[PDB]
C-alpha cells in the first residue's frame, strides 16, 4: 500500500528530523544548552543561548508549516473519501469513472489504520459482437424509433436490444414509437412491425 | 535564462507530443465509441446513435435529432468556427 | 561557507525532499488526467460522421 | 545516462526518467532505456451502420486506496527548546 505508507513514513521522518535538529549548533559552540551554562558565565553565553533559541524556533516553524500542509492535503483526501462513501456506498452513483473503472453497482467499505478502502463492484462487458444498425424502421410510411433499445440485425432479420446486453426481441409496437413521416432520416431501412393487437382481435 | 544561478528546471516526464497523442486517442474513443471505451472495451457505434443517446440523457426523445440532423450538424460546425475565432483573438 | 552549512544540513535535507516531492507530484498530476485509458485508439480514415 | 544501452523498440516503462524516455531491466539481461509506449496501438472499425452489442459481462472488483487520518502529535517549546534550565 502506497497511500497509507507515505502518510506514516513522512511523519516519522519529520519527527526524526526534529530530533536531529537538536544535535546541531546553528553556528554556536555547542549543541546542548547545558554545556555553555557549565563552562561559560550566563552574562557572556547569552548570545549563544539566543542563537540556539532562534535556530530551534526556525526548525519548529518549518515543522509547523509542513504539518499544516500535510493536514491540508489530509483534509482534502478525507473530504474526497467522505464523498466517495456517501455516493458509492450509501447508494448507487451515476458518475462514470468515479467509483472505479466500469459501471458501478455498490461498494463495501473496510476499516484501515489511519485510512479507508472501498470495495467497488463494477460492471464491464466481456464479449461483444458486431451488428448492423439503423436509427428508424419504415413500416407504412411512419418511422419507428426504439424507446430504450437500438435496432440491430444479424444479417437476415432485425431485432431490438438494450445498450449493455444482447437480448434480441421481435420488432413490435410496445417498444417503439412513431414520429413524423418516413422521408426525414438520411439512413432508414424497410421492415415490418409485429403489431400484437391484430392477431388477437380475430 | 534562470538556470545560471543553479535554479535548474526539471524536464517533464511527459512531453507535449504524447500529451497530444493522449488527447487524440481520447478524442477518437469519444467519437467512435461514446462512453463504452471509458468503462470497458470499446464498442463501435455510429455518431448519430451517440448523439441521440446524449439527447436521451437530458430528457429529450431521440426522434428529434434525425428530423433535423443537418441543422444540428451545421450548428455544431458554426460553434466550432466560433470557438476557434474567439480563441484566435488571452 | 560549506563548513558552516553542516549546522543547517537538516534544513537543507528538508528543502531538497520538499522540492523532490513537488517534482514527483507534478509528474503524477499529468498521469491522473491524460492517462485515463491504456489503449491508443486510432482515428479512422473515414471522416464521414 | 551511462551504464544503460539504448534500444529502438518501445515497451511499457516502470522507472521514469524524463523527456518521454524511461529505463528498465530486460533481456544475459541488462539495464536498457527506451521510449515509453502509451498503450496498445489498436484501431476501432467505424461505420455509419455498424454497432457492437455486448453479449456477456464479468463482475470485476477495483481496489482504491485513500488515507483519512494521521498520527496526532503535540509539541511544546518549554521541554523541546529548553531542557532543565530556567534561563
Ligand atoms: C438471424 O436470426 C434469425 C431469427 O432468429 C434466424 O432465423 C431462425 O434461425 C433458427 C435457427 O436455425 C431457425 O430455427 C428459425 O426457423 C429461423 N427463423 C426464421 C424466421 O428464419 C437466422 O438463422 C439468423 N441468422 C444468422 C446468420 O444467425
Ligand atoms: C423502402 O420502401 C419504400 C416505399 O415502400 C421504397 O420507395 C419506393 O421505391 C420505388 C423504387 O425504388 C418507387 O417506385 C416508389 O415510388 C417508392 N415509394 C415511395 C413511397 O417512396 C424504397 O425503395 C424501399 N427501399 C429499399 C431499399 O427497398
Ligand atoms: C460469460 O463469461 C463467463 C465467464 O467465463 C462464462 O462462464 C464460464 O462458462 C464456461 C462454459 O460454460 C465454464 O466452463 C466456466 O466454468 C464458466 N466460468 C464461470 C466463472 O462461471 C459464461 O459461460 C459466459 N456466457 C456466455 C453466454 O458466453
Ligand atoms: C465485426 O466486423 C468488422 C469488419 O467486418 C471488424 O472490423 C470488427 O472487428 C468485427 N467485430 C468483432 C467484435 O469481431
Ligand atoms: C455510409 O457511408 C458510405 C460511405 O460514405 C455510404 O456509401 C453509405 O451510403 C452510408 N450509409 C448510410 C446508411 O448513410
Ligand atoms: C532501430 O530501427 C530503426 C529502423 O530504421 C533504425 O534506424 C535504428 O538505427 C535502430 N536502432 C538501433 C539501436 O538499432
Coordinates of C-alpha atoms and ligand atoms in Angstrom, one line a residue:
Chain A
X1 CA 0.0 0.0 0.0
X2 CA 1.4 3.4 -1.0
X3 CA -1.1 6.0 0.0
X4 CA -1.3 4.6 3.6
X5 CA 2.5 4.2 3.9
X6 CA 3.7 7.7 2.8
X7 CA 1.5 9.4 5.4
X8 CA 3.2 7.4 8.1
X9 CA 6.8 7.4 6.8
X10 CA 6.8 11.2 6.1
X11 CA 5.6 11.9 9.6
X12 CA 8.2 9.5 11.1
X13 CA 11.0 11.2 9.2
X14 CA 9.7 14.6 10.2
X15 CA 9.8 13.6 13.9
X16 CA 13.3 12.2 13.2
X17 CA 14.4 15.4 11.6
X18 CA 13.0 17.4 14.6
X19 CA 15.1 15.1 16.9
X20 CA 18.2 15.6 14.7
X21 CA 17.7 19.4 14.8
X22 CA 18.7 19.5 18.5
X23 CA 22.1 17.9 17.6
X24 CA 23.2 20.9 15.6
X25 CA 24.9 24.1 16.9
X26 CA 23.2 26.5 14.4
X27 CA 26.6 28.3 14.4
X28 CA 27.1 28.2 18.1
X29 CA 30.0 26.5 20.0
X30 CA 27.9 23.6 21.5
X31 CA 24.7 21.7 20.8
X32 CA 23.4 21.1 24.3
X33 CA 22.4 24.3 26.2
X34 CA 23.7 22.9 29.5
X35 CA 27.3 22.8 28.3
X36 CA 27.8 26.5 27.7
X37 CA 26.0 27.1 31.0
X38 CA 28.5 24.9 32.8
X39 CA 31.7 26.2 31.1
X40 CA 30.7 29.9 30.4
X41 CA 29.0 32.5 32.5
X42 CA 25.4 33.4 31.7
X43 CA 26.2 37.1 31.1
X44 CA 28.7 36.1 28.3
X45 CA 26.9 33.0 27.0
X46 CA 23.6 34.9 26.4
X47 CA 24.3 35.3 22.7
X48 CA 24.9 31.6 22.1
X49 CA 21.7 30.8 24.0
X50 CA 19.7 33.3 21.9
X51 CA 21.2 31.9 18.7
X52 CA 20.1 28.4 19.8
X53 CA 16.6 29.9 20.6
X54 CA 16.4 31.3 17.0
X55 CA 17.5 28.0 15.4
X56 CA 15.1 25.9 17.4
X57 CA 12.3 28.4 16.7
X58 CA 13.1 28.3 12.9
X59 CA 13.1 24.4 13.0
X60 CA 9.7 24.4 14.8
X61 CA 8.2 26.9 12.4
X62 CA 9.3 24.9 9.4
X63 CA 7.9 21.7 11.0
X64 CA 4.6 23.5 11.8
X65 CA 4.3 24.7 8.2
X66 CA 5.0 21.2 6.9
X67 CA 2.4 19.7 9.3
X68 CA -0.1 22.4 8.3
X69 CA 0.3 21.5 4.6
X70 CA 0.1 17.8 5.3
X71 CA -3.1 18.4 7.3
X72 CA -4.5 20.4 4.4
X73 CA -3.9 17.5 2.0
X74 CA -5.2 15.0 4.5
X75 CA -8.3 17.2 4.9
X76 CA -8.8 17.2 1.1
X77 CA -8.3 13.4 0.9
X78 CA -10.8 12.9 3.8
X79 CA -13.4 15.1 2.1
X80 CA -12.9 13.1 -1.1
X81 CA -13.2 9.8 0.9
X82 CA -16.3 11.1 2.6
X83 CA -17.9 12.0 -0.7
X84 CA -16.9 8.6 -2.1
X85 CA -18.5 7.0 0.9
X86 CA -21.8 8.9 0.7
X87 CA -22.1 8.3 -3.1
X88 CA -20.6 4.9 -3.9
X89 CA -21.5 3.1 -0.7
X90 CA -24.7 4.7 0.6
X91 CA -26.4 4.3 -2.8
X92 CA -25.5 4.0 -6.4
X93 CA -23.6 6.8 -8.1
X94 CA -24.4 7.7 -11.7
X95 CA -21.0 9.5 -12.1
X96 CA -19.0 7.5 -14.6
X97 CA -15.4 6.5 -13.7
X98 CA -15.8 7.8 -10.1
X99 CA -16.4 4.6 -8.1
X100 CA -13.9 2.6 -10.2
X101 CA -13.4 1.6 -13.8
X102 CA -16.7 0.4 -15.2
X103 CA -20.4 0.7 -14.4
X104 CA -20.6 1.0 -10.6
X105 CA -23.1 -1.1 -8.6
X106 CA -22.1 -0.9 -4.9
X107 CA -19.0 -0.5 -2.7
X108 CA -18.0 -2.2 0.6
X109 CA -16.0 0.0 3.0
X110 CA -13.4 -1.6 5.1
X111 CA -11.5 -0.3 8.2
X112 CA -7.9 0.7 7.7
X113 CA -5.3 2.1 10.1
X114 CA -5.3 5.9 9.5
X115 CA -7.2 5.4 6.3
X116 CA -10.1 3.7 4.5
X117 CA -10.6 1.5 1.4
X118 CA -13.7 0.9 -0.7
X119 CA -14.5 -2.4 -2.3
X120 CA -16.1 -1.3 -5.6
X121 CA -18.2 -3.7 -7.7
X122 CA -18.1 -2.7 -11.3
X123 CA -19.9 -3.9 -14.4
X124 CA -17.7 -4.2 -17.5
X125 CA -18.7 -6.1 -20.8
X126 CA -16.6 -9.1 -21.7
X127 CA -17.6 -10.4 -25.2
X128 CA -19.1 -8.2 -28.0
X129 CA -20.5 -9.0 -31.4
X130 CA -20.6 -6.7 -34.5
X131 CA -24.0 -5.9 -35.8
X132 CA -25.6 -3.7 -38.5
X133 CA -27.8 -1.0 -37.0
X134 CA -30.4 1.6 -38.2
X135 CA -32.0 4.6 -36.5
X136 CA -35.5 4.0 -37.7
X137 CA -37.7 1.4 -39.4
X138 CA -40.0 2.4 -42.2
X139 CA -43.1 0.2 -41.9
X140 CA -46.0 2.0 -43.6
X141 CA -44.6 5.5 -44.2
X142 CA -44.2 6.0 -40.4
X143 CA -40.8 6.0 -38.9
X144 CA -40.4 3.7 -35.8
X145 CA -37.9 4.6 -33.2
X146 CA -36.9 2.5 -30.2
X147 CA -38.0 3.6 -26.7
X148 CA -35.0 2.2 -24.8
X149 CA -33.1 -0.1 -27.1
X150 CA -31.5 0.0 -30.6
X151 CA -32.3 -1.7 -33.8
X152 CA -29.8 -4.5 -34.7
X153 CA -29.6 -7.1 -37.4
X154 CA -27.9 -10.4 -37.7
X155 CA -27.8 -10.4 -41.5
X156 CA -31.4 -11.5 -42.3
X157 CA -33.9 -10.2 -39.8
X158 CA -33.9 -7.3 -37.3
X159 CA -34.2 -7.1 -33.5
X160 CA -34.0 -4.5 -30.7
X161 CA -31.6 -5.0 -27.8
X162 CA -30.7 -3.0 -24.7
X163 CA -27.4 -1.0 -24.6
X164 CA -25.3 -3.1 -22.3
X165 CA -26.6 -6.6 -23.1
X166 CA -27.7 -8.6 -26.2
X167 CA -31.4 -9.6 -25.7
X168 CA -32.9 -10.0 -29.2
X169 CA -36.7 -9.3 -29.4
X170 CA -39.2 -9.1 -32.2
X171 CA -39.8 -5.6 -33.5
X172 CA -43.2 -4.7 -32.0
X173 CA -45.4 -1.7 -31.2
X174 CA -44.9 -1.9 -27.4
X175 CA -41.2 -0.9 -27.5
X176 CA -41.4 1.5 -30.5
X177 CA -43.0 4.9 -31.1
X178 CA -43.8 6.7 -34.3
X179 CA -43.0 10.3 -35.2
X180 CA -43.5 12.1 -38.5
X181 CA -43.2 10.6 -42.0
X182 CA -40.6 8.3 -43.5
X183 CA -38.6 10.8 -45.5
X184 CA -36.8 12.7 -42.7
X185 CA -33.8 10.4 -41.7
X186 CA -30.8 10.2 -44.1
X187 CA -30.4 6.4 -43.4
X188 CA -33.5 4.3 -42.9
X189 CA -34.3 0.6 -43.6
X190 CA -37.5 -1.1 -44.7
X191 CA -39.1 -3.7 -42.3
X192 CA -42.4 -4.7 -40.6
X193 CA -43.8 -4.4 -37.1
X194 CA -45.4 -7.3 -35.2
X195 CA -48.4 -5.2 -34.0
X196 CA -49.5 -7.8 -31.4
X197 CA -53.1 -6.5 -31.3
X198 CA -54.0 -7.6 -34.8
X199 CA -53.9 -11.5 -34.3
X200 CA -55.9 -11.2 -31.1
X201 CA -58.9 -9.3 -32.4
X202 CA -59.8 -12.2 -34.8
Chain B
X1 CA 17.5 32.4 -18.6
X2 CA 17.0 31.3 -14.9
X3 CA 19.5 28.4 -14.8
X4 CA 22.7 30.5 -14.3
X5 CA 22.2 30.6 -10.5
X6 CA 21.6 26.8 -10.3
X7 CA 17.8 27.1 -10.4
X8 CA 17.7 24.1 -12.6
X9 CA 14.4 23.3 -14.4
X10 CA 13.5 19.6 -14.4
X11 CA 12.1 18.5 -17.7
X12 CA 8.6 16.9 -17.5
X13 CA 8.2 13.2 -17.7
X14 CA 5.6 13.6 -20.4
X15 CA 6.4 16.0 -23.3
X16 CA 3.8 17.9 -25.4
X17 CA 3.9 15.2 -28.1
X18 CA 2.5 12.2 -26.2
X19 CA 0.1 14.5 -24.3
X20 CA -1.2 15.4 -27.8
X21 CA -1.3 11.7 -28.6
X22 CA -3.3 11.1 -25.4
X23 CA -5.8 13.8 -26.3
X24 CA -6.1 12.4 -29.9
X25 CA -6.7 8.9 -28.7
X26 CA -9.3 10.1 -26.2
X27 CA -11.0 12.1 -29.0
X28 CA -11.0 9.0 -31.2
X29 CA -12.5 7.0 -28.4
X30 CA -15.2 9.5 -27.6
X31 CA -16.2 9.9 -31.3
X32 CA -16.1 6.3 -32.3
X33 CA -17.4 4.6 -29.1
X34 CA -19.0 7.2 -26.9
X35 CA -18.6 6.1 -23.3
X36 CA -18.1 2.3 -23.8
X37 CA -14.3 2.7 -24.0
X38 CA -14.3 4.7 -20.7
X39 CA -16.0 1.9 -18.8
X40 CA -14.7 -1.2 -20.6
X41 CA -13.8 -2.4 -24.1
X42 CA -14.5 0.0 -26.9
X43 CA -17.7 -0.8 -28.8
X44 CA -18.2 0.6 -32.4
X45 CA -21.1 2.9 -32.8
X46 CA -22.4 5.4 -35.4
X47 CA -22.1 9.0 -34.4
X48 CA -25.8 9.8 -34.8
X49 CA -26.5 6.9 -32.5
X50 CA -24.3 8.5 -29.8
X51 CA -25.9 11.9 -30.5
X52 CA -29.4 10.5 -29.9
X53 CA -28.2 8.8 -26.8
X54 CA -26.8 12.1 -25.4
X55 CA -30.1 13.7 -26.3
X56 CA -31.9 10.9 -24.4
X57 CA -29.7 11.5 -21.4
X58 CA -31.1 15.0 -21.0
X59 CA -34.7 14.0 -21.2
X60 CA -35.2 14.7 -24.9
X61 CA -36.6 12.0 -27.1
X62 CA -34.3 10.7 -29.8
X63 CA -36.8 11.2 -32.6
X64 CA -36.0 14.9 -32.9
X65 CA -32.3 14.5 -33.9
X66 CA -32.9 12.5 -37.1
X67 CA -35.6 15.0 -38.3
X68 CA -33.1 18.0 -38.2
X69 CA -29.7 16.3 -38.2
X70 CA -28.4 18.7 -40.8
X71 CA -29.4 21.7 -38.6
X72 CA -27.6 20.3 -35.6
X73 CA -24.5 19.4 -37.6
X74 CA -24.4 23.0 -39.1
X75 CA -24.9 24.4 -35.6
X76 CA -22.0 22.3 -34.3
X77 CA -19.7 23.4 -37.2
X78 CA -20.6 27.0 -36.6
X79 CA -19.9 26.7 -32.9
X80 CA -16.5 25.1 -33.7
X81 CA -15.7 28.0 -36.0
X82 CA -16.9 30.5 -33.3
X83 CA -14.7 29.0 -30.6
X84 CA -11.7 28.9 -33.0
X85 CA -12.2 32.5 -33.9
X86 CA -12.7 33.6 -30.3
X87 CA -9.6 31.7 -29.2
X88 CA -7.6 33.4 -32.1
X89 CA -8.4 36.8 -30.6
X90 CA -5.9 35.8 -23.6
Chain C
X1 CA 30.6 28.6 3.5
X2 CA 30.2 24.8 3.2
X3 CA 31.8 24.3 6.7
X4 CA 29.0 26.3 8.4
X5 CA 26.3 24.5 6.3
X6 CA 26.7 21.3 8.5
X7 CA 24.7 23.2 11.1
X8 CA 21.7 23.5 8.7
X9 CA 22.1 20.4 6.7
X10 CA 18.9 19.2 8.3
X11 CA 17.1 22.2 6.9
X12 CA 18.7 21.6 3.5
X13 CA 17.6 18.0 3.5
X14 CA 14.0 19.1 4.3
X15 CA 14.1 21.6 1.5
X16 CA 15.6 19.1 -1.0
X17 CA 13.0 16.5 0.0
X18 CA 10.2 19.1 -0.4
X19 CA 11.3 20.0 -3.9
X20 CA 11.6 16.3 -4.8
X21 CA 8.0 15.8 -3.6
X22 CA 6.9 18.8 -5.6
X23 CA 8.6 17.4 -8.8
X24 CA 7.2 13.9 -8.4
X25 CA 3.7 15.2 -7.7
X26 CA 3.9 17.5 -10.7
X27 CA 4.9 14.4 -12.7
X28 CA 2.0 12.4 -11.3
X29 CA -0.6 15.1 -11.9
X30 CA -0.3 14.6 -15.7
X31 CA -0.7 10.9 -15.3
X32 CA -4.0 11.3 -13.5
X33 CA -5.6 13.5 -16.2
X34 CA -4.5 12.4 -19.6
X35 CA -3.7 8.7 -19.0
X36 CA -7.3 7.7 -18.4
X37 CA -7.2 4.9 -21.0
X38 CA -4.5 2.4 -21.5
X39 CA -5.2 1.8 -25.3
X40 CA -4.4 4.3 -28.0
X41 CA -7.4 4.5 -30.3
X42 CA -6.5 5.4 -33.9
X43 CA -8.7 7.9 -35.8
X44 CA -10.5 6.0 -38.7
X45 CA -9.6 7.2 -42.2
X46 CA -13.3 7.8 -43.0
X47 CA -14.3 11.3 -42.0
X48 CA -18.0 10.9 -42.8
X49 CA -19.6 11.4 -39.4
Chain D
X1 CA 22.8 8.4 -19.0
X2 CA 25.7 5.9 -18.6
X3 CA 25.6 2.2 -18.0
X4 CA 22.3 1.5 -19.9
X5 CA 22.2 0.7 -23.6
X6 CA 19.6 2.3 -25.9
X7 CA 17.2 0.1 -27.9
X8 CA 14.9 1.4 -30.6
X9 CA 11.9 -0.8 -29.6
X10 CA 9.3 0.5 -27.2
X11 CA 7.6 -1.2 -24.2
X12 CA 5.8 0.0 -21.1
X13 CA 8.3 1.5 -18.7
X14 CA 8.4 1.3 -14.9
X15 CA 11.3 3.6 -13.8
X16 CA 10.6 7.2 -15.1
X17 CA 13.5 9.4 -16.2
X18 CA 12.0 12.4 -18.0
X19 CA 11.6 13.7 -21.6
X20 CA 9.5 10.7 -22.6
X21 CA 12.2 8.1 -22.1
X22 CA 12.4 5.5 -19.2
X23 CA 14.7 2.8 -18.1
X24 CA 14.1 -0.9 -17.2
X25 CA 15.9 -4.2 -16.7
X26 CA 15.1 -6.7 -19.5
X27 CA 16.9 -9.1 -21.8
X28 CA 22.0 -12.1 -20.5
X29 CA 19.9 -9.3 -19.1
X30 CA 21.0 -5.7 -18.6
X31 CA 19.5 -2.2 -18.0
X32 CA 18.0 -0.7 -21.1
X33 CA 16.5 2.6 -22.0
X34 CA 13.6 3.1 -24.4
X35 CA 10.8 5.5 -25.3
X36 CA 7.7 4.7 -23.2
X37 CA 4.7 3.0 -25.0
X38 CA 1.5 4.9 -24.5
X39 CA -0.6 1.8 -24.8
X40 CA -1.7 -0.9 -27.3
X41 CA -1.8 0.7 -30.7
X42 CA -5.2 -0.5 -32.0
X43 CA -7.8 0.8 -34.4
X44 CA -11.6 0.7 -33.9
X45 CA -13.6 -0.1 -37.0
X46 CA -16.0 2.7 -37.5
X47 CA -19.0 2.7 -39.9
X48 CA -22.3 4.6 -40.2
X49 CA -24.3 1.3 -40.0
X50 CA -22.1 -0.8 -37.6
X51 CA -22.7 -1.3 -33.9
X52 CA -21.3 -3.6 -31.2
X53 CA -23.8 -5.0 -28.6
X54 CA -22.1 -7.0 -25.8
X55 CA -23.5 -10.4 -25.1
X56 CA -21.6 -11.3 -21.8
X57 CA -20.3 -9.5 -18.7
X58 CA -17.8 -10.0 -16.0
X59 CA -18.3 -8.7 -12.5
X60 CA -15.0 -7.0 -11.7
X61 CA -13.7 -5.5 -8.4
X62 CA -11.4 -2.5 -8.3
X63 CA -9.1 -1.6 -5.4
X64 CA -8.8 2.1 -4.3
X65 CA -6.6 3.4 -1.5
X66 CA -7.4 6.6 0.4
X67 CA -6.0 7.9 3.7
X68 CA -8.2 9.8 6.0
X69 CA -6.1 10.5 9.2
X70 CA -2.6 10.7 10.5
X71 CA -0.9 10.5 13.9
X72 CA -1.9 13.3 16.2
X73 CA 1.2 14.8 17.9
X74 CA 1.6 17.7 20.4
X75 CA 4.8 19.8 20.6
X76 CA 5.6 22.3 23.4
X77 CA 8.5 24.7 23.3
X78 CA 9.4 24.6 27.0
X79 CA 10.5 21.0 27.1
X80 CA 11.7 20.9 23.5
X81 CA 13.6 24.2 23.1
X82 CA 14.7 24.3 26.7
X83 CA 16.0 21.4 28.9
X84 CA 16.1 21.8 32.7
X85 CA 17.4 25.4 32.7
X86 CA 15.4 28.4 33.9
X87 CA 17.5 30.9 31.8
Ligands
LIG1 C1 -30.7 -14.5 -37.7 O1 -31.8 -14.5 -36.8 C2 -33.0 -15.2 -37.4 C3 -34.1 -15.1 -36.4 O2 -33.8 -15.8 -35.2 C4 -32.6 -16.7 -37.6 O3 -33.7 -17.4 -38.2 C5 -34.1 -18.5 -37.4 O4 -33.0 -19.4 -37.2 C6 -33.3 -20.6 -36.4 C7 -32.0 -21.3 -36.3 O5 -32.0 -22.5 -37.1 C8 -34.4 -21.4 -37.1 O6 -34.8 -22.4 -36.2 C9 -35.6 -20.5 -37.4 O7 -36.6 -21.2 -38.1 C10 -35.2 -19.2 -38.1 N1 -36.4 -18.3 -38.3 C11 -36.6 -17.7 -39.5 C12 -37.8 -16.8 -39.5 O8 -35.9 -17.8 -40.5 C13 -31.4 -16.7 -38.6 O9 -31.0 -18.1 -38.7 C14 -30.2 -15.9 -38.0 N2 -29.1 -15.9 -38.9 C15 -27.8 -16.0 -38.5 C16 -26.8 -16.0 -39.6 O10 -27.5 -16.1 -37.4
LIG2 C1 -38.3 1.1 -49.0 O1 -39.7 1.3 -49.2 C2 -40.0 2.5 -50.0 C3 -41.5 2.6 -50.0 O2 -42.1 1.3 -49.8 C4 -39.4 2.4 -51.4 O3 -39.7 3.6 -52.1 C5 -40.2 3.2 -53.4 O4 -39.2 2.9 -54.3 C6 -39.7 2.5 -55.6 C7 -38.5 2.1 -56.5 O5 -37.3 2.2 -55.7 C8 -40.5 3.6 -56.2 O6 -41.1 3.2 -57.5 C9 -41.7 4.0 -55.3 O7 -42.4 5.1 -55.8 C10 -41.1 4.3 -53.9 N1 -42.2 4.7 -53.0 C11 -42.1 5.6 -52.0 C12 -43.3 5.8 -51.2 O8 -41.1 6.3 -51.9 C13 -37.9 2.2 -51.2 O9 -37.3 2.0 -52.5 C14 -37.6 1.0 -50.3 N2 -36.1 0.8 -50.1 C15 -35.5 -0.3 -50.4 C16 -34.0 -0.3 -50.2 O10 -36.0 -1.3 -50.9
LIG3 C1 -19.8 -15.4 -19.8 O1 -18.5 -15.5 -19.2 C2 -18.4 -16.4 -18.1 C3 -17.0 -16.3 -17.6 O2 -16.1 -17.0 -18.4 C4 -18.8 -17.8 -18.6 O3 -18.8 -18.7 -17.5 C5 -17.9 -19.9 -17.8 O4 -18.6 -20.8 -18.7 C6 -17.8 -21.9 -19.1 C7 -18.6 -22.7 -20.1 O5 -20.0 -22.5 -19.9 C8 -17.4 -22.7 -17.8 O6 -16.6 -23.8 -18.2 C9 -16.8 -21.8 -16.8 O7 -16.6 -22.5 -15.6 C10 -17.6 -20.6 -16.5 N1 -16.9 -19.7 -15.6 C11 -17.6 -19.1 -14.5 C12 -16.7 -18.2 -13.7 O8 -18.7 -19.3 -14.3 C13 -20.1 -17.8 -19.3 O9 -20.4 -19.1 -19.9 C14 -20.2 -16.8 -20.4 N2 -21.5 -16.7 -21.0 C15 -21.7 -16.7 -22.3 C16 -23.2 -16.7 -22.7 O10 -20.8 -16.8 -23.1
LIG4 C1 -17.0 -7.0 -37.0 O1 -16.6 -7.0 -38.3 C2 -15.7 -5.9 -38.7 C3 -15.5 -5.9 -40.1 O2 -16.5 -6.6 -40.8 C4 -14.5 -5.9 -37.8 O3 -13.6 -4.8 -38.1 C5 -14.8 -6.0 -36.3 O4 -13.6 -6.2 -35.6 C6 -15.8 -7.1 -36.1 N1 -16.2 -7.1 -34.7 C7 -15.9 -8.1 -33.8 C8 -16.3 -8.0 -32.4 O5 -15.2 -9.1 -34.2
LIG5 C1 -22.3 5.1 -45.1 O1 -21.2 5.8 -45.7 C2 -20.8 5.3 -47.0 C3 -19.6 6.0 -47.5 O2 -19.8 7.4 -47.5 C4 -22.0 5.5 -48.0 O3 -21.7 4.9 -49.2 C5 -23.3 4.8 -47.4 O4 -24.4 5.1 -48.2 C6 -23.5 5.3 -46.0 N1 -24.7 4.6 -45.4 C7 -25.7 5.3 -44.8 C8 -26.8 4.4 -44.3 O5 -25.7 6.5 -44.7
LIG6 C1 16.0 0.9 -34.7 O1 15.4 0.7 -36.0 C2 15.5 1.8 -36.9 C3 14.7 1.5 -38.1 O2 15.2 2.2 -39.3 C4 16.9 2.1 -37.2 O3 17.0 3.3 -38.0 C5 17.7 2.4 -35.9 O4 19.1 2.5 -36.1 C6 17.5 1.2 -34.9 N1 18.2 1.4 -33.7 C7 19.1 0.6 -33.1 C8 19.7 1.0 -31.8 O5 19.4 -0.4 -33.7

